[PDB]
Scaffold this active site. Structure first.
Site, PDB file in Angstrom:
ATOM      1  CG  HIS A 155      -3.017   2.287   5.947  1.00 31.15           C
ATOM      2  ND1 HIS A 155      -4.245   2.761   6.364  1.00 31.15           N
ATOM      3  CD2 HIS A 155      -2.958   2.516   4.599  1.00 31.15           C
ATOM      4  CE1 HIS A 155      -4.921   3.208   5.312  1.00 31.15           C
ATOM      5  NE2 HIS A 155      -4.155   3.090   4.231  1.00 31.15           N
ATOM      6  CG  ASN A 173      -5.487   7.895   0.642  1.00 29.74           C
ATOM      7  OD1 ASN A 173      -4.342   7.444   0.955  1.00 29.74           O
ATOM      8  ND2 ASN A 173      -6.475   7.115   0.307  1.00 29.74           N
ATOM      9  CG  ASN A 199      -5.014   6.691   4.152  1.00 30.98           C
ATOM     10  OD1 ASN A 199      -3.980   6.625   3.536  1.00 30.98           O
ATOM     11  ND2 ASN A 199      -6.103   6.017   3.800  1.00 30.98           N
ATOM     12  CG  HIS A 241      -5.237   0.597  10.512  1.00 25.08           C
ATOM     13  ND1 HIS A 241      -5.447   1.802  11.124  1.00 25.08           N
ATOM     14  CD2 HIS A 241      -4.832   0.894   9.260  1.00 25.08           C
ATOM     15  CE1 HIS A 241      -5.250   2.793  10.277  1.00 25.08           C
ATOM     16  NE2 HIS A 241      -4.900   2.261   9.127  1.00 25.08           N
ATOM     17  CD  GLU A 262      -1.745   2.502   1.269  1.00 28.42           C
ATOM     18  OE1 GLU A 262      -0.771   2.672   2.029  1.00 28.42           O
ATOM     19  OE2 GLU A 262      -2.438   3.430   0.813  1.00 28.42           O
ATOM     20  CG  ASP A 303      -4.549   5.532  -2.107  1.00 30.44           C
ATOM     21  OD1 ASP A 303      -5.427   4.621  -2.128  1.00 30.44           O
ATOM     22  OD2 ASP A 303      -3.921   5.793  -1.045  1.00 30.44           O
ATOM     23  CG  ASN A 304      -0.508   6.260  -0.296  1.00 35.27           C
ATOM     24  OD1 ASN A 304      -1.536   6.756   0.280  1.00 35.27           O
ATOM     25  ND2 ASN A 304      -0.105   5.019  -0.089  1.00 35.27           N
TER      26      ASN A 304
HETATM   27  O1  LIG Z   1      -5.012   4.108   1.713  1.00 39.09           O
HETATM   28  C1  LIG Z   1      -6.146   3.523   1.370  1.00 39.09           C
HETATM   29  C2  LIG Z   1      -6.822   2.695   2.265  1.00 39.09           C
HETATM   30  C3  LIG Z   1      -8.063   2.150   1.866  1.00 39.09           C
HETATM   31  C4  LIG Z   1      -8.559   2.432   0.563  1.00 39.09           C
HETATM   32  C5  LIG Z   1      -9.762   1.879   0.088  1.00 39.09           C
HETATM   33  C6  LIG Z   1     -10.234   2.183  -1.197  1.00 39.09           C
HETATM   34  C7  LIG Z   1      -9.490   3.042  -2.021  1.00 39.09           C
HETATM   35  C8  LIG Z   1      -8.267   3.569  -1.567  1.00 39.09           C
HETATM   36  C9  LIG Z   1      -7.809   3.284  -0.284  1.00 39.09           C
HETATM   37  N1  LIG Z   1      -6.636   3.796   0.149  1.00 39.09           N
HETATM   38 CA   LIG Z   2      -3.255   5.663   1.229  1.00 42.87          CA
END
Ligand SMILES: O=c1ccc2ccccc2[nH]1
Ligand SMILES: [Ca+2]
Ligand SMILES: CCCCCCCCCCCCO[C@@H]1O[C@H](CO)[C@@H](O[C@H]2O[C@H](CO)[C@@H](O)[C@H](O)[C@H]2O)[C@H](O)[C@H]1O
Ligand SMILES: [Br-]
Ligand SMILES: [Ca+2]
Ligand SMILES: [Ca+2]
Ligand SMILES: [Cl-]
Ligand SMILES: [Cl-]
Length: 337
Positions: free
Chosen positions: A97, A206, A150, A116, A35, A251-252
């Site tokens: 995470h 996020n 997150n 988590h 992730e 996202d990241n």
């Molecule tokens: O960091 C994350 C954690 C959960 C998550 C769920 C759906 C889409 C993006 C996500 N990103």
């Molecule tokens: Ca993330």
């Protein structure tokens, strides 16, 4: 009105135009998520893996998570599992995470890892023991202003900004909070003597990261499809500077320390990543953002596909012409640029 906000938040119609790279390989040994990842100046890459997130797919709910290590100076980097040592942490419930690193003046490498264990959030602080390929657990951080963390970005061995992707801790309440579109997610500055909210009112904050000179903080707001750029001040406050919009769920955020470019892992279609369907799996998409303070930031799709190779890309970073891409709960891809 609600159809409609749902369809746009979750980008439920989006299909991905492909964007290929010359030579990509799956990283052997990553099958349960990758992730977040972070690459040191020397080419060592940390990857967290095995995340179990409520409502989200995971192929091995009974296996605990791990922090993996790849040496990206190798021609064909193999992953190994880092040994976590110490008695201050229960590994049997390790559920990692976002991560972030901090290199002290003495060159000690600290790894911070969002964890988590059960429904909850902590940030675990580790010292990286390079010769040993091990992580020495130092401290478990938890706090009322870190209810649903997150990702974080470290600015000292126990100092970081953290995104909370929800206001609530309980997953049943989080699920209502998300579907109601409250947008109560928020960002916390954490340090030993001073813990405070620095920004708030996000629809699923996020990724988060910082410019190499420490003057700007970037925050991804997943369900709004925005990245927010804030000025970061010597007293650790943040003030809003600008907002970029995208046609993808961001996202990241990784930041290249030489150029300050952002490299962003993204979910083109939210329906597919939030409601897993093996026959209609989520795809992958990586953006590079250059000149993010200029009048028109340059945004390039560097890699994009529909899930036939890599599902659910969350993170991407580059090192000497190679691109490593991680996912929520699937594999990881290593590519020539
Ligand atoms: O960091 C994350 C954690 C959960 C998550 C769920 C759906 C889409 C993006 C996500 N990103
Ligand atoms: Ca993330
Ligand atoms: C702060 O803003 C907070 O979140 C949203 C909008 O961001 C507001 O309103 C929210 O509540 C209702 C719940 O029945 C939703 O159907 C609506 O879509 C949503 O926008 C909240 O009343 C306020 O608590
Ligand atoms: Br090395
Ligand atoms: Ca991170
Ligand atoms: Ca806001
Ligand atoms: Cl709660
Ligand atoms: Cl710039």
């Amino acid at each position: 009105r609600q159809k409609s906000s749902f369809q746009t938040r979750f980008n439920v119609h989006r299909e991905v135009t492909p964007v290929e790279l010359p030579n990509c390989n799956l990283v052997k040994g990553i099958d349960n998520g990758s992730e977040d990842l972070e690459i040191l100046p020397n080419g060592l890459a940390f990857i967290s893996s095995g995340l179990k997130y409520p409502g989200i797919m995971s192929f091995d709910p009974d296996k605990s998570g791990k922090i993996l290590l790849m040496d990206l100076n190798e021609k064909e980097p193999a992953v190994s599992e880092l040994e976590i040592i110490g008695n201050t942490l229960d590994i049997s419930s390790f559920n990692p995470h976002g991560i972030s690193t901090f290199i002290d003046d003495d060159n000690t490498v600290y790894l911070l890892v969002v964890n988590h264990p059960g429904s909850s959030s902590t940030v675990e602080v580790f010292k990286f023991q390079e010769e040993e390929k091990s992580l020495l657990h130092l401290k478990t951080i938890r706090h009322k202003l870190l209810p649903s963390v997150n990702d974080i970005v470290a600015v000292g061995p126990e100092h970081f900004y953290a995104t909370n992707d929800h206001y609530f801790i309980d997953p049943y309440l989080k699920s209502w909070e998300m579907h109601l579109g409250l947008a109560w997610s928020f960002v916390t500055y954490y340090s030993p003597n001073d813990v405070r909210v620095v920004a708030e009112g996000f629809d699923f904050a996020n990724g988060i990261n910082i410019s190499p000179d420490g003057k700007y903080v970037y925050i991804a707001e997943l369900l709004a499809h925005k990245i927010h750029v804030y000025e970061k001040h010597a007293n650790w406050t943040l003030t809003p500077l600008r907002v970029l919009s995208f046609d993808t769920l961001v996202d990241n955020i990784s930041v290249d320390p030489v150029t300050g470019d952002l490299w962003v892992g993204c979910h083109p279609n939210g329906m597919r990543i939030f409601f897993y369907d093996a026959e209609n799996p989520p795809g992958s998409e990586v953006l590079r953002i250059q000149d993010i303070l200029s009048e028109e930031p340059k945004v390039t799709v560097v890699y994009a596909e529909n899930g036939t190779v890599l599902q659910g890309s969350t993170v991407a970073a580059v090192y000497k012409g190679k691109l490593l891409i991680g996912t929520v709960f699937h594999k990881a891809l290593y590519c020539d640029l």
